[model samples]
Target: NIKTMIPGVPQIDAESYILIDYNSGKVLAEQNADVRRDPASLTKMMTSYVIGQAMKAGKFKETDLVTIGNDAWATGNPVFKGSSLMFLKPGMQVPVSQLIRGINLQSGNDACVAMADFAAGSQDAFVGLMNSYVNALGLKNTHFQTVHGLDADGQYSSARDMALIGQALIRDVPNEYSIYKEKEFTFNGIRQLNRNGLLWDNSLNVDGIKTGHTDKAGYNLVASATEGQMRLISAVMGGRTFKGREAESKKLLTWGFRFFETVNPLKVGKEFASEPVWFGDSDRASLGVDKDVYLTIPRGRMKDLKASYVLNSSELHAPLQKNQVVGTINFQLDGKTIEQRPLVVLQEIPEGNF
Candidate 1:
């Protein structure tokens, strides 16, 4: 059954963008999200994300000491200023905490390059780690040509891909990832403020993920903020200026936050009775979700949302992983469809004895 609800907030721009609730994984707003575009320094979010992953895996420690060499020194200068820096003189030893501050707070290419080298002994090997993590994260429209987002040929990502990476970064590494919120960090006697202006604007609740730019990739940003228990992540790529990127990213995030709210279609541990059965001891089956299917709908739309289950072939047999998609719950607005969240089996169901 469907019921009427409030409308969504007006949006601006047609450029590719996506906003999703961090806690629910619900897509709040999207436009051309799947279209491939240059992610620019937004790439650094993943760079920081990979670093967080390495830290969690015990590949390194926050207190681990890393020496800045000529390579990192080369990244410091006028062009990369305002970005994270270690003020590393060749042979200078800095803690991993400082290096991370270099990347997250300042978008420091030098910090990123140094961290990469420390992680794998070389940038090339470190890139291997980045690509491996991309594959492992199931990021489909992303690739890395350099570790520090220093601009290289064929390096790019889509808004959708960035969103996935952003979500993973927030949920996958809570402790290490929270460092992005620090407004300032004193490294090597230089007090560098975070480049992300939203951190200071106070109009938005942005903490950060990363921000980047190059002549080829333009200005890019991946930003996140929370309201109450709900958090939203927005990624914007290829803006012509830093202010433009921040303005547009804030608009994207604000629109998502204002217009939609996250909803879980299935009750926790509640089974979906729409699954089909074939050649199994049981004549019928039920499905659930691997985690939860978070959906963002127009404000106050929950009362009108309706669900219908559709099977791929109207028949499912024997063992099924928690991921088997059996149907979808359609959230309707003003008699027009707004969003659809899929229903998945939460656990394996073996062929039961009839």
Candidate 2:
């Protein structure tokens, strides 16, 4: 039988954090994940997301040139004192690809501003798009006020929300999302390393994500790692130091990977079961999910998992359309329901001959 519950959660020191299985969307552990906190440079995740959306929509291309203006240039100035920069200068024409590299690899405030300006013509307009994106994601606890994620009055997000954003980025545009894995980016003869230290940790196969910090928000990080068939996303916010955030994130991820495993009990479009069709052209109808169904549970417990289905209509008298939800599949662990997903018709069924 599967374990009734996960082991005790990891001990982490931070204002808020979350660890989630990216494939199954199961939150393994979390602390204060709903409380709002400053995101700092982590805001660039959405900035980059908007850029990806624009690219997918045919709004721009990687080779397109964006002329850096004073607004973005000022953020990199010594007097203004931005946290990080791509060394952008006023009137310099840079490619969208390099600007994306600067944002992901360098945590560049100037790069964020430049991308925002390029995407929406002004930071304010770009911010509106960011909030719109947040709304479309159905994130209730998150709001954005700055393109660069500097300390601002209204810009805030929770660990859970940040994890959701990271998952969306990886799921929606995986090819473009690969940019975050680059260790270092160089432009105009200057090189800067990615702030996400997990990329440097040899013990873990950690990959893309973002990091952030400020006196007001403390040190923060959002990271992802893949071990075997399982991939998890961890977020740490409001730590006392950069090392502290990374260490805590590592701790949570290590704890999760140590005890849990993600399994796909059913594949989409593959018939897992069949039901009798009383008045259909065929004697039976095949049922399955339209997308893969995933679950994360204690390791080595998959053999004990049970799956059963319940049909909404006792007897199908079709002309049934394809992809019609006819019932639901219940997944049980230790005789307790862990997940329930809609079971849909995989093929259309015509009415039987009278």
Candidate 3:
């Protein structure tokens, strides 16, 4: 017997929240994760994601110019009063690169609109693209009504979906994702600090992501931090205040990193064990998993982890398929099974005549 012990999850106060292991997509902790709510500026993460996808498809280049209109980033702009802006004046020929900085570092609704129009040529068209990706990503309870993610009718996203979006943005768009790490971005003679104050926290290398706040939506944040090789994505929505969202999110991520570890124990083509086959052309068959297998378990238990196969029978039959499961591999920690995977044959075992 082994002692299985670790501290309990930290308390998080919010309407909906979830923390995820980025590499393994492990759900470390969650609350009302599937329930949807106003996405607010957090919706801009999707906005940035759509833009990144468009660029990947060669729709536009970073150096390409976007002609600005007075309607975009107007001072005291009555259209979207109190909205975050990149301060782009009318008739300015801005490039795609700068607008991305505005979206990630400044949380600029103005920049989001500019990039959306530049990517899809219209607001509704770009919004449609955003939702299309919502489906593409398999986010069931999410829909995007606006590119900037301002409070709008029928625009909602769940905490789980928001965490996934952040994970995808970092994985699929590394070049653009790097912008989120910056503390400030200056354009058009104005400088704005990233809304995510956690970027400055030395205790945790909180790299990049997005933040949101509106009277109707409250404060929301999709934050990411890395400790060693492990990266965690967290979404905390509908908070009482900005500090509240930040503190709660930080608490969740810190606990996740402290209490758990994600490790790759089994990988495709890497044989872990061998089984002697009955009446097979080959004397034995190699055993391995079909794909890479990763597991997140209590911290410090990885060194004590164990892998053993539970066989259906003492012997395996010959004339087997290329990748037939012969047994189930049990991964144990502290004498308790933590995860399991199929123990499969590496190659077909043809029957042999005695």
Question: Where does candidate 1 clash, by residue pair?
Answer: 3-304, 84-106, 84-108, 288-344
lDDT of 1 by residue, 1-354 (tens): 223434453453436767777877776667777777777667777788778888888999988999887878844455456654556667888899888887888777788878888888898888888888789988888889888766557776887788788889888987767888888988766798887878886787888777766666667677898776468898666666657878888887777767666767766457765455665555556665556566666656678777655555556776666577766656565666666656676566677765
* Best TM-score among the predictions, by candidate number: 2
Query: What would the per-residue lDDT of candidate 2 be over residues 186-206, giving only the tens digit for each residue?
Result: 898877787787899999988
Candidate 2, residue 326: CA error in Å?
Answer: 1.6
Q: How far is candidate 1 from the true structure (C-alpha RMSD, Å)?
A: 4.3
Rank candidates, lDDT, best first: 2, 3, 1
Candidate 2 stretches with Cα past 4 Å from truth are 1-5, 75-80, 352-354
Pairs with steric clashes in candidate 3? none
The lDDT leader among the candidates is: 2
- Which model, 1 or 2, shows the larger lDDT? 2
lDDT of 1: 0.73
Question: TM-scores, in order shown?
Answer: 0.79, 0.95, 0.86
